[PDB]
Design a protein around this ligand. Structure first.
Ligand SMILES: COc1cc(OC)c(NC(=O)Nc2cc(C)on2)cc1Cl
Ligand SMILES: COc1cc(OC)c(NC(=O)Nc2cc(C)on2)cc1Cl
Ligand SMILES: COc1cc(OC)c(NC(=O)Nc2cc(C)on2)cc1Cl
Lengths: 396, 396, 396, 396, 396
């Protein structure tokens, strides 16, 4: 209308967009800063960045942009674009991204009394420290440090308001716990003026239903097939072909983990310890299997039991496991044939007890390795904090 | 011409590109918003974004850009570039992308009576929630929330017009169902002015011919080779080398699925349940195979049938399966040789019935596992909604 | 010089860069549009885009930028940068890229009589439909739709000139066939003015020397090793270890194809059909091998030939394949030993004919599967159109 | 100072940044163009681009930017930013990148006599043709075509100066040979004015120490294990399990090569021919191994030597290889037992000579395949040009 | 306030942002340059770049921007944005990135006496030379060359101040050692004016806890399973199936290393030498295993010991290893049977000593290969400098 056009011509008369809008150049300008988290787009572990879509809320006052509604009965609010009125230069300190602002400057609301409101939307890529420890059951605390870059505490008194999460669109993978905030003022090497800033800590918990179903459960079940080697009879030449196949094919899990873990030499992830533990157990099974196989094909008449394994694996362990173990010329020739058969029976008896001694080790190590696996998987997986919370919330 | 040059010099005289073009600063300016979907470029499941190429249709009126054709007989339409006339700041709220506008401002058509038309093309990357449940047979609903960012309901009365799909260039992978739209006005924490907005919901159905031919059909056929272990004779030492090879090599399918599924701990995909089901069936085959192998190489004269498997696998299951199962010195020596052979025949008879008992388990488990596989694959795959529609449209 | 400086000061006097340069505001301005393809950078199949480096040729006339050489003896051509003279807004409609123009505005040549020439270089990423059918032997037709965005047929009469390929720098992978063009005028929902546009169809043929040497030839040779299972004697326990190794290791080819094929559920690629065909043939070999192995270890005295395979695999197929197949006490004991040996010979004879019956199946299936493979590979590979052209141009 | 401020106010008085700085508008303006290569960042083979970090050296004269030092005793050089003085529009023609200039306009040095110097730094991504032939031992020639885009030969006489490599920071992977340059003037379809341009050809040699240690040497050593199959005794059922394991696991090398080779159907890389050659040799070993295994388990009394292999593999090849190869009732029964044993010895003798005949083939093919491998690896690897230079410079 | 608005109108009166702010145009302007490292974002080995987030500290003086506080009692500091006051053009020389500045120009602090301070934040991607030698235990020295691009030593006297690391946010993967700096002045081909510059060398040490736990430790343990082949009895046909499985499956480690090592043909990485060493040791085990297997299945009556291995592996090595090794017609027939058995015993005795001779080689090579592995792994891993420091800091 005619009044709005007239008002706009009067507000920008002798207006300098470089000066602070204070009426007295001795008191700081109070700027109220806030934040609104809209969603957590992606939390990259390798690059240790946090990509979020948030809004900002800057609110200050302007002494020069003032008018009364009596002279302009229709207009109660005017809007100035970027570059025509003074705005604070509050920006993210971390800003792990190519261009450093990431604010998408929009129009600036102006009151009927000079109060100024500014709501810029942007996608921020801050740099926070991802702690890969108790990795499937970890809680992350990523900081968001906001503050003015050129105005000190004597010019721009930056206040703070509580963060707003009214509308969050849950990410699904990360469970938001909260977002508390602080205002603190520090000192720097450039200047004696304190520089106040506001830091919003984003606390979020990882939902462990996905990884524990794709990395933990399959690892337990597949590693259980290595315990099945001790049930194969030694006659079927497949004991080594089963133990070595499972062991060397279970490596694919850590190749998946290597694509998720940052190469940080600071803390060993729990999933790495548990994956490392299940390799040694399977690896030791192959070592024990070889010990069994050399008792089976012992090639008798080339040694004897040292009477020490005679009482251990045949007397004590065998029961506790409950396994329970011219005619003279013609006469000389037929006697030799019978004597040859008798010696073969004695050789078969010695070879028979060696085979049973290899069966005791299979049954003994089946129970020894079974208890080793269950108390190790439980011990590692329960060792993490808030593990009972993680399974009571996602699984149950 | 001379008239067009004269008209352009008159329209921008005392024209302010910051004021609303209304003639009375008390009524809202009606802006008609529409949309035209041109193609769905890509639907990323991992990042949960939607990249589309669409046009926009903004249509309002301007009180100041008015003239009569009598004075200017030749010109009936003038065009102003970005930054010289007032335009609404309607933008996508979600805008999961670095720069937030994505509109590629073009020329603005101007009527002979002041009506304004604006048709900006752009490629929009919105953030919608991808629901990975019944994944090969899922229907997605992605929102497109458009609305003014600085003008409230009392200044910019944003109306809505139906979306246009006259020319869609079908994507091939995604089948478009429709695109309905709404206009709603909400309240926010900044202001008491309601902020109307228009939301276009993009409903699209995934064509399941590709994945079901590259992930479902090959999985069924390859998993059928694990059922072939029960047909191998136990003499060929390859029963374990066949069951363990198929099981550990079928893992490559989920490595492909892991590259498509977002790491969302909210719902288990159907293709994950069906892939998990076909691993346990194959995994249980190896466990059963080991049970068979220890009946084959039973090493007789070290145990006896407990008369419980004597009647089950040899009497009941065997029939229902229909398998149907100085001379004295010389005399003493030859008698021993015959007696040795007689004992060997008795040992061979006992070992023979153990081998047949292992054949009954192969035939029994062949039928038990075959019915387990067919009713599980059908049960999981039919469990999804609109599955009959998905196969009647893409396959048939 | 002094004349060029004087001329430049006269041309921009009272010049408006927003008006059409026509002298009468009732006739359209003729704009001649052309194109020059310089190289095809990349044809992405997954994203269905076409990245090309081309030049543009816009040619119109300007009524105001006119002067005579008599007054300015030295200058015959002036050049204006972007934003100082009127230029048409012709742009690519498809433009599957973030920023939509992709033209890199340069200087604009100006005649001595007002004729205007404009040659902008740019790298265009258009969206065309990639048809993955007869994939190694396919010909693609990608469109390039150019036209004005704000001027209709009554204001900007867009003409067309033939595309120029004088200098093409052949891509090596794609063989260019031609690039014909059209001009057509359509109607839209906004306006009653027809909007003429020019479409250049890029026709290109894929050279099939690379893929057919890295995907087709190796697949044929490796799949031929599955036919080698029928030559192994059954005594060497490696028949299953050879058939199952080749089958499960040939999967790597489709993992390579999956990285090239777009996930389009519209047409099955020929290379997918041929790769699927060679899996079933190899897969059926393992099924047949198991049938052979159970004839070898038949465990006689537990069944007999049903006299149906007695005449087929032993009488008909065996010939057409041409394989050609106190003294009394002592007397009783030695008689038993001889009788025991006689029964063993009868048991060995029955087991011998079972082994030969397994050899007939190996020789019979060797010829049955060999003819199955050759007529299937030839049948699928010849089924594609312009296949003889593809091998006569690239291979020969 | 006061003189520099005064001089700057005088130089931009009545100065037009659009006119050529010549004093007479009839002679071309001489522009001296040069180049300085600073490093070769990356040479991508798949996309056929060349990313280099180079400087430019443009040097012309300006008639209007002239002054005497007597009036301004302090200043001898002034600097104008981009957009205030006339600069040539020399740009890279190839420019395989999104934005086409890639020059990062900086300040422009100005002489005390009008001579102008301009040194813009930039990272250029040009499109050159990568020839993958003799791939580990190839030399590439990438062009850099620079020239004006809007000024012809009658306006901007573009000269050339030799390229400067004083400071190159060697890349490590690519060995620079030289960078010669040319100036040539061509004709185009737009205009009759010749357009001179300068082309700098970047000649560079690939260092072959890396690939030949990670692709060539490991391939030779691993392929040598396939020759070890002929030393295994046939009793150990692992001949097929060794030949088929090496063959199907050596495929990983070409999967690495496929990630480096562009999909160009123009020339077969040498490393592809050598990798293809070592597959056929290993593949033929498995075929020969099967021929051996059917001589070992020949199942005698089912055939006889055709007297042709009797003299070849047992008489000629065996020596040149130097391998050197009531009482009557009782009497009848014992005679049968002895006769049964005698027939078994005759059957064992026939089976023994079949096994030795399989040993001759192992020893014969061990020498036949060994000479096949050495003369093929040497023949392919020496076939490339400048191969002796490549090994005398990098290895030795 | 009124004074700040008045002051801003006076400072930009007759102010030229192109002239140097010196009062006498004969002395250079002293500019103090510094740097503050905030974190090391990523050190890419393949592309040889260094992405860091740092601040800059430029400090000079301005003669024209001076005023007294007496006239303006309130304001003591004014701030000018980019493009309104003179600023030096100091920029990174290396700048391995698309856009070359990477400085994110901010406001410029102005003193009450003319001293100027400028603190631009930016993320810099410099190009330094990554030396992949002693790769897990390497220390890198990356340069940061800063200097003016258009002002020489006679105009801009660039000084230097020590780098500041007060607040570093340790990266976790890289351990910072220090960041010393230099100022040097060189000569170039353009000009006779020396161009001073400041170079900051970033010295950083890689923490070796991650790789040595994921690449070194697993390689040692897995390679130890190849030494387990010498403990398997030869009767179980799995010696080759174990040696060849470990060898061909250990290749996955270098596929991981190939994704980290730049393709530089300048220095062989230590981890590559150690991975190459552990392949030959495992590869030689398979060669030795084949030698053992041909002693086991020696097929006697086809050769004899040459009396050279009779004393080595049976007399010397066997002890040092301590292994310790009508009646006439009836009479003729039974005599033949006994004689046949006697010849079999003599054939079994000869075959028995061949099998034991194969056991000596297993025990001899078990000790020979065990000492080969330990002294090779230790020798290679200790060969690197500062290896004891790397394990005393990260592991211990
Ligand atoms: C390669 O590493 C894996 C291994 C796996 O086992 C073999 C799985 N299997 C899996 O996750 N199955 C289920 C079950 C439910 C419920 O959901 N998913 C996945 C990966 Cl990635
Ligand atoms: C690795 O996972 C796969 C496994 C597969 O089986 C082995 C296939 N095979 C396939 O898809 N064959 C056909 C048939 C038709 C018709 O089209 N394609 C593909 C993948 Cl990706
Ligand atoms: C594929 O190459 C690997 C091989 C591996 O062994 C099989 C591992 N295993 C591993 O790292 N285990 C541990 C132990 C601790 C403590 O932390 N991690 C990893 C990779 Cl990448």
């Amino acid at each position: 209308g005619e009044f709005q056009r007239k008002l706009y011509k009067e507000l920008v008369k002798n207006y300098n967009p470089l000066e602070r809008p204070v009426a007295n150049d001795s008191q700081p300008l109070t700027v109220y800063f806030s934040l609104s988290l809209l969603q957590i787009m992606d939390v990259d572990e390798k690059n240790q960045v946090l990509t979020t879509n948030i809004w900002l809320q800057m609110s200050w006052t302007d002494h020069y942009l003032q008018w009364n509604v009596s002279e302009y009965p229709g207009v109660k609010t005017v809007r100035f674009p970027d570059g025509q009125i003074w705005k604070p230069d509050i920006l993210l300190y971390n800003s792990a991204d190519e261009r450093f602002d990431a604010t998408f400057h929009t129009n600036v609301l102006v009151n009927s009394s000079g109060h100024c409101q500014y709501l810029p939307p942007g996608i921020f890529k801050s740099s926070c420290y991802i702690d890969v420890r108790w990795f499937p059951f970890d809680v992350q605390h990523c900081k968001l440090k906001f503050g003015s870059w050129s105005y000190g505490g004597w010019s721009l008194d930056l206040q703070m308001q509580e963060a707003d999460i009214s509308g969050y669109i849950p990410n699904g993978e990360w469970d938001l716990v909260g977002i508390p905030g602080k205002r603190s003022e520090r000192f720097y090497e450039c200047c004696k003026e304190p520089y106040p800033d506001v830091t919003f800590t984003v606390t979020m918990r990882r939902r462990t239903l996905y990884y524990g179903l794709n990395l933990l459960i399959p690892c337990v079940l597949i590693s259980a097939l290595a315990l099945l080697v001790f049930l194969l009879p030694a006659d079927s030449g497949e004991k080594i072909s089963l133990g070595i196949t499972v062991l060397l094919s279970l490596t694919v899990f850590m190749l998946l983990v290597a694509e998720i873990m940052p190469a940080t030499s600071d803390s060993v992830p729990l999933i790495a310890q548990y994956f490392a533990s299940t390799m040694i157990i399977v690896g030791l099974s192959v070592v024990v299997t070889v010990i069994v196989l050399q008792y089976h094909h012992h090639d008798p008449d080339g040694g004897k039991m040292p009477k020490w394994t005679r009482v251990i694996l045949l007397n004590w362990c065998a029961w506790f496991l409950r396994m329970k173990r011219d005619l003279a010329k013609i006469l000389e020739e037929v006697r030799y044939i019978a004597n040859r058969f008798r010696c073969q029976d004695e050789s078969e008896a010695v070879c028979s007890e060696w085979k049973f001694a290899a069966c005791v080790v299979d049954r003994l190590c089946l129970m020894a390795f079974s208890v080793f696996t269950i108390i190790c998987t439980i011990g590692i997986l329960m060792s993490a904090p808030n593990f009972v919370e993680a399974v009571s919330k996602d699984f149950a």
